[PDB]
A = this chain, B = another copy of it.
Amino acid sequence: VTYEEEAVPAPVRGRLEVLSDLLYVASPDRAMVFTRTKAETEEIAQGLLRLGHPAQALHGDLSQGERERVLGAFRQGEVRVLVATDVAARGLDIPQVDLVVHYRLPDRAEAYQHRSGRTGRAGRGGRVVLLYGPRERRDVEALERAVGRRFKRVNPPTPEEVLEAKWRHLLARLARVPEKDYRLYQDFAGRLFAEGRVEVVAALLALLL
């Protein structure tokens, strides 16, 4: 195994929210999320959507043609999140991805591995994350038995983790903006600096994040 696995604690309800934060912090090019039912794939996708992530749902009800295009969307970068059921998920036509997340848990060990292999954009490297509920702890120990491995027990992202991630995203915007367009606002930038009021700029960031 050349990928790492983390067991991360979440409350079935706040499950979506935790995940969203995971993504924001981790910022992976491609990610799959696994769940039990095609309906969840839907909720979760819509959910993540409104939560501001490029998410699609992968199930077998998807037509041959619909599938094939949800997948392409994925390989380009147009879709950055695929939410699938283990069944819909079988196939060689599935890309390798930066990060695998188990939303609900896989009952038996083989589902775990089929799911987990899709990470590692080489056969080497990759992160897997399992989400467990407050009681499901016993379920997690059980899997580790099956899988014959100890998963790392890692906390969800702190608010300032996210804040930190958002800020990183933002320097990324600024990078893009070319002199051709910021050159016009030099003077103002000057004023702010020469006044030296963090509060005002703190304010400015307030409504950019």
A-side interface residues toward B, CB under 8 Å?
A: 163, 167, 173-175, 177, 179, 181-186, 188-190, 192-193, 196, 198-209
Contacts and interface: CB of A to CB of B under 8 A. Distances in A.
Contact of A185 (B174, B175, B183, B202): B202
A188 B207 contact: no
B177 A203 contact: yes
A188 to B, nearest CB: 5
Contact of A174 (B173, B189, B200): B200
A198 B208 contact: no
A184 B208 contact: no
Contacts of A196: 193
Given A167-B188, A188-B167, A193-B193, A181 B206 contact: yes
A192 B186 CA distance: 14
Contacts of A182: 199, 202-203, 205-206
Contacts of A174: 200, 203-204, 207
A188 B203 contact: no
A190 B198 contact: yes
Contact of A202 (B173, B188, B205): B188
B189 A199 contact: yes
A179 to B, nearest CB: 8
Given A207-B208, A208-B207, A208-B208, A192 B181 contact: no
A199 B185 CA distance: 8
A209 B111 CA distance: 46
Contacts of A198: 186, 189-190, 193
Best-buried of A173, A184, A189 by chain B (most CB within 10 Å): A189
> Which 5 pairs show the lowest CB-CB distances between chains A and B?
A185-B205, A182-B202, A174-B203, A189-B201, A189-B198
Contact of A204 (B167, B184, B208): B208
A206 B174 CA distance: 8
Nearest to A171: B200
